[PDB]
């Protein structure tokens, strides 16, 4: 196994996967790393199992069918993983944590957003449907365009949705278009 979190790239008390070479923090690792559970399998394996399981699941989709789709366990699960691949790009870290708004010229957004927030939310089954937990992710990037302006700070949430964007077509399986 690794020696560091795959997520942050540290050292420190990490556990370990059962099927791959992967290693996590407890809480770097989304759902949290489990108490017991010998084999332990990570949220990595957990998905590739689902795809494997059902071949067709990587067939082209469209965007709004996969935004109605319910939470149950399957898409609960590929929301955690498309956190997690949020978490694992060093610059979501400006994301992670409750933002504030003091800048001349600027006010701050209606309904701030911060990954945490949405981590804490999929924990508490919050999110009924996957459209949910994306416009709060889209929401995020989108308040900080708005709020910085001309600032190229704005290049930020415009890489970190990037990382966002791409995750989400490749996990949910989105149709390919020009
Ligand atoms: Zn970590
Ligand atoms: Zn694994
Ligand atoms: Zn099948």
Redesign the pocket.
């Given at each position: 196994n690794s020696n560091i979190c795959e997520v942050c790239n540290k050292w420190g008390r990490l556990f370990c996967?059962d099927?791959?070479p992967?290693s996590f923090h407890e809480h770097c690792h989304i759902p949290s790393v489990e108490a017991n559970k010998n084999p332990w399998?990570?949220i990595?394996?957990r998905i590739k199992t689902i795809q494997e399981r059902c071949p067709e699941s990587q067939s082209g989709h469209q965007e709004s069918e996969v935004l109605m789709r319910q939470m149950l366990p399957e898409e609960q699960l590929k929301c955690e993983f498309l956190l997690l691949k949020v978490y694992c790009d060093s610059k979501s870290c400006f994301f992670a944590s409750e933002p504030y708004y003091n800048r001349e010229g600027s006010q701050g957004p209606q309904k701030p957003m911060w990954l945490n927030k949405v981590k804490t939310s999929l924990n508490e089954q919050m999110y009924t449907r996957v459209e949910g937990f994306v416009q709060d992710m889209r929401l995020i990037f989108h308040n900080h365009k708005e709020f910085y302006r001309e600032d190229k700070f704005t290049r930020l949430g415009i890489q970190v949705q990037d990382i966002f964007e791409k995750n989400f077509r490749n996990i949910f399986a989105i149709q390919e278009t020009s």
């Open positions: 996967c099927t791959c992967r399998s990570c990595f394996c």
